[PDB]
Amino acid sequence: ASSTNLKDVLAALIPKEQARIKTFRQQHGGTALGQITVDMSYGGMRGMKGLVYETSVLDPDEGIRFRGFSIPECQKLLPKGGGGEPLPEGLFWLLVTGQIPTGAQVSWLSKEWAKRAALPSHVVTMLDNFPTNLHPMSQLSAAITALNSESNFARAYAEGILRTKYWEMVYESAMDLIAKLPCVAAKIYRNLYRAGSSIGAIDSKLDWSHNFTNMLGYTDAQFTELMRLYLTIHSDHEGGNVSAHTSHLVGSALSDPYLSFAAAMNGLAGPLHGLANQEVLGWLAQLQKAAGADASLRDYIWNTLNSGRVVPGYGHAVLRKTDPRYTCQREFALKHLPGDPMFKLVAQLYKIVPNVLLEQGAAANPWPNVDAHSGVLLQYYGMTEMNYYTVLFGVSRALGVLAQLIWSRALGFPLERPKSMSTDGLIAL
Amino acid sequence: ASSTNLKDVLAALIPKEQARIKTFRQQHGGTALGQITVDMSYGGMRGMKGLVYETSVLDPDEGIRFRGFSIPECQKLLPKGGGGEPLPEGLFWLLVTGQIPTGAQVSWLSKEWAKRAALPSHVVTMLDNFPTNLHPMSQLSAAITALNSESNFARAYAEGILRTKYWEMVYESAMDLIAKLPCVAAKIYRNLYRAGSSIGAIDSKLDWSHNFTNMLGYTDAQFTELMRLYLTIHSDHEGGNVSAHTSHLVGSALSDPYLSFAAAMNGLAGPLHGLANQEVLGWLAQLQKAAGADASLRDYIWNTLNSGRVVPGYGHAVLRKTDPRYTCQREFALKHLPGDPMFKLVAQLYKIVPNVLLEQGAAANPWPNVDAHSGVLLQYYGMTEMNYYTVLFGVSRALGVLAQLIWSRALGFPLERPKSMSTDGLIAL
Numbered sequence: 001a002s003s004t005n006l007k008d009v010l011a012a013l014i015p016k017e018q019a020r021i022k023t024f025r026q027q028h029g030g031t032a033l034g035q036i037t038v039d040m041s042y043g044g045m046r047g048m049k050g051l052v053y054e055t056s057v058l059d060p061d062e063g064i065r066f067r068g069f070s071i072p073e074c075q076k077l078l079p080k081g082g083g084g085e086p087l088p089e090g091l092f093w094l095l096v097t098g099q100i101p102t103g104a105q106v107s108w109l110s111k112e113w114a115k116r117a118a119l120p121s122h123v124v125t126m127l128d129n130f131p132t133n134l135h136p137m138s139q140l141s142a143a144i145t146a147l148n149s150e151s152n153f154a155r156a157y158a159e160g161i162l163r164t165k166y167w168e169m170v171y172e173s174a175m176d177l178i179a180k181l182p183c184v185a186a187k188i189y190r191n192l193y194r195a196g197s198s199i200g201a202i203d204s205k206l207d208w209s210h211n212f213t214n215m216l217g218y219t220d221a222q223f224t225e226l227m228r229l230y231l232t233i234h235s236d237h238e239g240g241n242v243s244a245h246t247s248h249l250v251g252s253a254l255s256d257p258y259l260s261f262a263a264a265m266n267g268l269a270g271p272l273h274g275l276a277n278q279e280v281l282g283w284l285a286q287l288q289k290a291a292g293a294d295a296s297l298r299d300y301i302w303n304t305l306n307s308g309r310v311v312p313g314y315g316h317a318v319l320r321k322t323d324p325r326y327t328c329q330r331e332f333a334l335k336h337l338p339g340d341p342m343f344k345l346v347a348q349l350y351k352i353v354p355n356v357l358l359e360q361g362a363a364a365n366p367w368p369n370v371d372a373h374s375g376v377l378l379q380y381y382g383m384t385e386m387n388y389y390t391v392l393f394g395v396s397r398a399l400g401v402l403a404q405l406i407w408s409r410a411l412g413f414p415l416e417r418p419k420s421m422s423t424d425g426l427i428a429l
Numbered sequence: 430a431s432s433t434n435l436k437d438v439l440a441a442l443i444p445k446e447q448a449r450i451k452t453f454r455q456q457h458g459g460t461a462l463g464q465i466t467v468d469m470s471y472g473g474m475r476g477m478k479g480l481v482y483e484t485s486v487l488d489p490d491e492g493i494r495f496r497g498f499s500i501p502e503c504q505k506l507l508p509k510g511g512g513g514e515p516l517p518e519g520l521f522w523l524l525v526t527g528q529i530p531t532g533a534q535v536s537w538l539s540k541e542w543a544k545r546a547a548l549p550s551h552v553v554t555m556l557d558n559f560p561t562n563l564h565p566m567s568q569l570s571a572a573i574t575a576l577n578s579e580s581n582f583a584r585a586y587a588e589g590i591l592r593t594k595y596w597e598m599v600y601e602s603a604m605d606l607i608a609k610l611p612c613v614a615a616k617i618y619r620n621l622y623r624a625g626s627s628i629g630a631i632d633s634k635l636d637w638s639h640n641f642t643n644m645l646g647y648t649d650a651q652f653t654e655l656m657r658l659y660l661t662i663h664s665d666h667e668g669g670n671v672s673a674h675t676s677h678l679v680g681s682a683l684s685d686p687y688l689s690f691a692a693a694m695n696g697l698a699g700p701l702h703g704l705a706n707q708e709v710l711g712w713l714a715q716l717q718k719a720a721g722a723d724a725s726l727r728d729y730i731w732n733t734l735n736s737g738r739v740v741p742g743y744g745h746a747v748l749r750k751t752d753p754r755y756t757c758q759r760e761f762a763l764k765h766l767p768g769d770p771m772f773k774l775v776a777q778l779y780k781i782v783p784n785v786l787l788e789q790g791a792a793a794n795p796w797p798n799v800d801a802h803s804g805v806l807l808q809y810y811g812m813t814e815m816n817y818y819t820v821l822f823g824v825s826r827a828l829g830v831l832a833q834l835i836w837s838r839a840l841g842f843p844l845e846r847p848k849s850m851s852t853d854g855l856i857a858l
């Protein structure tokens with residue numbers, strides 16, 4: 001009897017996995033996975049295997065996998081609006097469940113996210129009073145912190161629930177959070193760039209992406225398509241990234257999903273992380289200020305490097321090859337906006353940057369990452385407020401980080417608390 | 430010629446250390462410090478040596494050390510107001526510099542923090558509109574995020590400064606942040622619990638703690654003393670703790686000091702972390718609701734344990750012995766509030782809890798931690814709004830986390846980005 005419900009599905013799945021991890025441990029907990037060196041310690045845990053994170057795994061060479069699903073694979077397997085790009089909704093189901101959802105599953109997330117999307121008055125209020133020189137990311141992060149008012153987990157914890165049920169309240173507070181995000185994100189949008197206008201209402205019959213674009217104010221049918229791919233691809237990127245790890249870390253301490261996502265956002269906002277979004281465009285934007293020669297393009301990159309700055313959108317802590325998310329984006333451009341002069345500059349940089357980066361002999365991965373290609377796409381559709389780009393990244397990222405958060409709690413992962421050491425201490429060791 | 434200035438001192442100190450870490454590495458980077466097992470991975474990096482963090486080191490048995498200075502040591506060596514408890518100001522100098530400051534050094538932080546303490550209008554505004562059911566910690570964290578408007582590092586980065594100078598803008602934005610905190614913290618205080626009143630102005634001639642207590646509204650001379658010790662002891666606790674690690678992690682991505690501290694706060698707010706402050710009092714507060722027998726005290730602890738809850742204020746991820754911060758606090762009570770019935774209950778719990786915790790056979794460290802003893806002290810002085818306690822923790826914590834943040838950047842520590850692994854992947858490995 002009956003119909004769709006992620007939670008019932010999860011209820012069936014938790015005990016299995018719990019079991020599976022206990023036996024594995026019972027036999028392998030003692031197993032050495034790896035060693036820790038000094039350089040690793042001074043180096044940002046680079047190359048250290050430090051966390052269990054289920055939803056996605058990043059391969060240095062091939063790039064990210066949602067189960068074991070690649071981006072090309074997702075593209076073909078995940079349900080679509082009607083109609084070429086994958087619905088982040090179906091992405092979400094996959095991440096949570098390990099399985100490819102049916103259209104019918106997918107429609108259910110959509111409605112669910114539609115039903116839950118509602119903002120409390122104190123939040124609307126704060127957003128409406130924020131100054132316009134407060135960065136969109138700051139605005140977003142303070143809003144999500146402020147939503148903690150409403151945390152179902154915060155409240156259940158205060159009532160004393162058994163630790164076993166944590167995952168259930170997490171899940172609710174995840175689903176409500178994902179639901180609200182686009183509203184928050186769009187409110188910021190409309191306040192800063194469309195002053196006096198309103199975000200409008202959520203239509204239960206649309207997919208999350210589409211409601212998002214309406215709230216943003218965009219009509220173009222291809223924009224919507226852009227949005228669906230963008231929000232799916234930015235999903236998740238394993239557990240070690242600043243944003244995800246931040247969530248995992250904060251969430252480990254039993255801070256509710258709102259506080260943990262917000263902290264994640266503060267991490268996403270750093271230049272070496274998701275703000276690279278934004279930095280890309282600005283650098284591109286200066287480049288053109290200062291149709292160029294590869295040689296003048298090259299002088300320009302050198303001048304950055306010489307100046308003690310990074311080239312934004314290039315390099316990666318884990319990837320060692322061109323990001324497939326980059327390829328993914330390129331391939332969208334080539335289909336849709338192949339004559340765009342911004343696009344063409346990005347295409348030409350691809351010819352030059354890595355070469356310059358090899359020449360310099362510093363970057364371990366001279367190839368571009370997702371950030372190098374995302375803004376170009378946005379600008380094209382008219383969304384040219386580049387200090388806002390990272391917000392979009394932030395909305396997508398909720399998908400992966402929250403899908404995991406639920407599992408961490410389902411699995412009972414304890415407090416994240418490694419040991420630190422000072423230089424003198426290490427010197428002594 | 431000339432007078433005091435932390436920054437000139439740091440300018441002299443950075444190059445030395447830079448040098449010292451390069452040679453050490455040159456000879457030891459390859460050295461294996463440790464191994465990683467499966468259990469560690471599933472276990473929250475427990476026992477993994479994962480970070481370099483200079484300011485303080487925690488010993489499992491003896492407890493925390495500021496250089497190599499113990500709490501008792503600090504107590505005797507750090508300058509005092511006039512007059513028994515150490516000035517957090519002098520703590521700060523120690524952490525940053527490695528050296529014990531002179532009174533004269535100490536007076537300089539004080540004035541400096543006094544000069545810089547000023548809140549921008551959009552912040553005051555948001556705090557004044559926040560609802561009273563928004564938790565103080567949430568309020569604090571959203572306020573600090575919102576201050577990023579003002580980040581000197583955010584602005585310098587946007588202008589393109591050479592990476593080498595980062596530490597300098599960090600330092601400014603650290604000193605301004607520490608300066609403002611008590612204002613923010615007190616504004617929250619006054620809005621929630623003292624509605625219609627005002628925090629008043631900062632008097633350059635007082636020490637930070639004392640301005641803080643005036644802003645809070647407290648007159649008692651011993652309260653002030655309490656505040657100075659409280660804010661010094663809560664300083665720092667090595668790099669691995671959720672709050673510090675969060676800052677270190679977010680800061681690694683070149684998010685400004687404001688965003689990184691705020692994220693740290695979201696971590697501090699979880700029940701297994703700094704909110705334990707608060708949880709302690711509430712549990713104590715229910716205990717008494719429900720002068721008891723050790724046996725009834727024991728039934729009560731069992732009922733918690735049986736219920737799938739933790740006993741707040743007991744246990745630790747690293748400490749294996751009674752926290753000296755706990756002893757520190759106890760010893761303050763015994764001097765000042767030895768007949769306080771709350772104090773006496775906490776003293777009696779000390780007799781029972783660990784025993785019950787040993788009996789159960791789960792907790793690796795059955796002894797109490799700082800949180801078990803802090804609120805008791807506050808309540809005594811009239812500060813009995815326990816959902817506010819963690820704010821105080823948060824203000825102190827700024828001291829250690831920011832003192833480090835400056836060094837991370839001075840030392841050029843890269844992006845924190847370890848590798849994650851899923852269960853299937855590990856199973857495969």
Ligand SMILES: CC(C)(COP(=O)(O)OP(=O)(O)OC[C@H]1O[C@@H](n2cnc3c(N)ncnc32)[C@H](O)[C@@H]1OP(=O)(O)O)[C@@H](O)C(=O)NCCC(=O)NCCSCC(=O)O
Pocket residue numbers: 271272273274275276277305309310311312313314315316317318362363364365369370371841843844
């Ligand atoms: C992403 C990174 C932080 C990875 O950092 P890492 O793993 O420490 O890099 P690495 O191992 O190649 O670093 C070796 C050296 O190369 C330098 N280097 C690496 N990437 C670059 C870059 N794009 N421009 C110039 N220098 C660079 C790096 O700064 C370091 O210099 P130094 O030894 O003086 O500190 C780095 O490539 C970078 O700063 N890239 C530019 C910022 C960027 O595009 N960020 C987005 C990352 S992925 C998508 C997202 O996160 O939003």
Ligand SMILES: CC(C)(COP(=O)(O)OP(=O)(O)OC[C@H]1O[C@@H](n2cnc3c(N)ncnc32)[C@H](O)[C@@H]1OP(=O)(O)O)[C@@H](O)C(=O)NCCC(=O)NCCSCC(=O)O
Pocket residue numbers: 412414415700701702703704705706734738739740741742743744745746747791792793794798799800
């Ligand atoms: C601080 C801790 C999170 C350390 O966590 P840990 O290193 O994973 O603890 P551990 O190695 O002893 O855990 C072994 C088991 O003992 C359980 N345990 C440990 N501490 C306690 C406690 N105080 N009450 C009941 N159960 C406990 C722990 O939950 C785990 O149970 P299970 O295996 O079902 O998950 C834990 O002791 C705890 O939850 N304490 C209560 C909360 C608290 O007082 N927090 C403040 C910590 S220090 C000051 C600050 O951070 O603000």
